[PDB]
A = this chain, B = another copy of it.
Amino acid sequence: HMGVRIENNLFYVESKNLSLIIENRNGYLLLKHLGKTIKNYKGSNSVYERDHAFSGNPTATNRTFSLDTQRQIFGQHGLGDFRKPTIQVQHSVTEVTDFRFVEAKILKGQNGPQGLPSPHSMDDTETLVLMLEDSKAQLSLTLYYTTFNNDATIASYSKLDNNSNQEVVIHKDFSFMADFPAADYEIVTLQGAYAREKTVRRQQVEQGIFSISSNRGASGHAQTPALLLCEQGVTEDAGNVFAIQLMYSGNFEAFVQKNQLNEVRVAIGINPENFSWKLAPEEYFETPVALVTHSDQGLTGISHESQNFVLKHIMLSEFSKKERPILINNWEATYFDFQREKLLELADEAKKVGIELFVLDDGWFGNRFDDNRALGDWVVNEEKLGGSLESLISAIHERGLQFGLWLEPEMISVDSDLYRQHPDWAIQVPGYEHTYSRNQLVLNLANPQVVEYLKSVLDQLLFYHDIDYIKWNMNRNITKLGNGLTYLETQMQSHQYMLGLYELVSYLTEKHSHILFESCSGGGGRNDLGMMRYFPQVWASDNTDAIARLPIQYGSSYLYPTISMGAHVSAVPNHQMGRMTPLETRGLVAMMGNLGYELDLTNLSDEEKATIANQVNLYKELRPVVQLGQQYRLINPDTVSNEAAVQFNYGNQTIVTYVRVLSVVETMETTLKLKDLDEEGLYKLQENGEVYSGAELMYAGLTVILSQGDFLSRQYIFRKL
């Protein structure tokens, strides 16, 4: 039985196979258990209350009760707990608060912070509402924990109300925190860099503080809003994992602190850096939604739990189970140098190879002949497109292709009519020169006039044109914060920017819900669950190299479903890596993602065209298995591995893709075992027609054979009889 229960001084938040059990101890909230379901909890793992030196107390005479030593669900500074705090509010002459539990209620169904991306499909949910007050400061803090009946995830956020008659300032306000008992732990995060997105990192939890954070105003290429606290020795197949993640796309922090007693705190939320929030009397602030997800089935267990929750409760219902079109994108194909003739020729060739959607990338607007001007000027360049966009779209439609279009709405070039008309719309500091990045500036989406302008321009574009797909790029990070009328308003503008972005994209995606929107940020610069609430796919990386894509895809699909993960077959030598790879390998690697194409089809040989047509035919078959099926990592492409292998199961279909990076010699063949088959099931391998029992494939495995050479790949295709 799942949902929320209040039983004496215990609160039980009960999702599928995951419980959070909280005790009200005289107004203090104690984390008793987070993990697998326990009913009738007695307290076997209660903290032993001891006099711990230099750990102080709320009363004079009791040295054994200390907030420095109790396991909690939110952290304050100044009351004796010296671990990193997750709520800190300035009021009058202090930033000490003492929030005490006052009242609990339970909600059913849809529930979340206003103006921030939050779970959908919430009919079968309950939400625990923990109302806390600081009587002296006349502030309220309300904690929300929501259950899910179909996933081992709990969602959380808080609301802070100013009930005083002075201005108060929020300095810290995270979305989730948990104190875990002293034990050995490891952590997994996804970091990396541009063209190396979502690099999977694993390390031992050590005394002190480890953190990942973005202060770039976007979540960023080099860190994802996720932190996995793992049982020592976790594998792909076994051990406990708790994943904490944030549905937010701006500045964030995730941290793990191991204190002086070996206790462990984890939290995620809005980054304290670049953040303060003024609340006038009666005003309130709600945090973005955090998620805590659990598996006892190792890292593959947590992947599945996280992917399922995303598919069911984050990604738009309209698209979460809808096969995505195989596209052609002209970007690497032509860059800025194109016109109508070239576009339709490319469309002609895309149609012949069975591609479904044609995306017109950067360069169609203003005087955008390079990347040094025109952002902000969303006016069709009818000269370059050889007539109206409407006439181009009709042409593409008449050739049997859906039509897609690139935008970068959050940006403005100095050399643009927009900047000439409104220079104050850029993020900037009075009396400081701009900082430039790809020779462009960022629009101040904390300015409601900016948001209004973009809603108008884009609504016009989408209503007057028959566009099937949008690619929403964002190609620099935020510098020179100084647009506020006060310092405090500047401190608010980075979060207000996000609120502005979310108002904009929720509006357009809702008002044009037939359109498939793909998010982008020089690839995976903002590939997080805030964006995935509105954009059901994402351009995973500007790196389109088949081999460099291996670790990128590993990380990009670690917590997010494969269906989200844009992957394109591109030209050789590869533009980022300067590398030759087989077209077969480029194909098989992209087919582990959401397949498209990004190269000049008009310049290929007859043979290369035929190969591509075969790849398209193959993927039309594999697409449901890849996009709708269950993913199993078999060999992980890490820093030392020479191999990658990923399996997908979907009903009677099982496929396995294998890639070897460097050629080897006098090295015995790898044995590759499949996972999650029926032992007694019979599996017919397409290439040789041989029928193998599931037990054979899982416990004996495939001897993997390759010729001599770098970057070779193969695929095994099975049908269960």
Contact = CB atoms under 8 A, between A and B. Distances in A.
A209 B198 contact: no
A556 B197 contact: yes
A94 interface: yes
A656 to B, nearest CB: 12
A477 B60 contact: no
A709 interface: yes
Given A195-B543, A668-B261, A699-B36, A235 B239 contact: yes
Nearest to A236: B233
Given A194-B522, A197-B524, A262-B667, 16 more contacts: A33-B699, A39-B693, A53-B194, A60-B434, A78-B481, A82-B477, A90-B487, A93-B484, A96-B482, A183-B671, A192-B552, A196-B541, A200-B636, A218-B478, A221-B521, A225-B529
Contacts of A662: 547, 661-662
Nearest to A483: B93
A56 interface: yes
A567 to B, nearest CB: 12
Interface residues of A, number: 193
Interface stretch (A5-13, A576-584, A588-596): A576-584
B577 A499 contact: no
Contact of A436 (B59, B479, B543): B59
Given A208-B189, A708-B577, A218 B526 contact: yes
Interface string A102-124: 00000000000001111000000
Closest 6 CB pairs of A and B: A198-B555, A217-B478, A578-B708, A56-B437, A117-B533, A197-B524
B233 A80 contact: no
B693 A479 contact: no
A659 to B, nearest CB: 14
A206 interface: yes
Contacts of A721: none
A52 B666 contact: yes
Interface stretch (A40-48, A312-320, A361-369, A452-460): A40-48
B93 A430 contact: yes
A197 B702 contact: no
5 contacts: A52-B666, A189-B208, A192-B207, A197-B527, A573-B709
Contact of A44 (B274, B433, B697): B697
A215 interface: yes
B44 A692 contact: yes
A703 interface: yes
Contacts of A203: 204, 206
Nearest to A521: B218
Nearest to A553: B198
Contacts of A225: 528-530
A259 B222 contact: yes
Interface in A89-145: 90, 92-96, 98, 115-118, 136
Contact of A117 (B218, B237, B483, B502): B502
B487 A93 contact: yes
Interface string A514-548: 00000001111111111001100000111100011
A525 B489 contact: no
A705 interface: yes
Interface in A249-305: 259-263, 273-274
Contact of A56 (B61, B198, B224, B476): B476
Contact of A502 (B54, B116, B191, B222): B116
A552 to B, nearest CB: 5
B436 A224 contact: no
A503 interface: yes
A429 B94 contact: yes
Nearest to A220: B525
Nearest to A46: B703
Contacts of A547: 662
A513 interface: no
Given A56-B436, A78-B479, A530-B117, A223 B208 contact: yes
B555 A192 contact: yes
Contacts of A86: none
Given A195-B665, A699-B36, A705-B48, A435 B78 contact: yes
A420 to B, nearest CB: 16
Contact of A668 (B189, B221, B263, B527): B263
Nearest to A253: B209
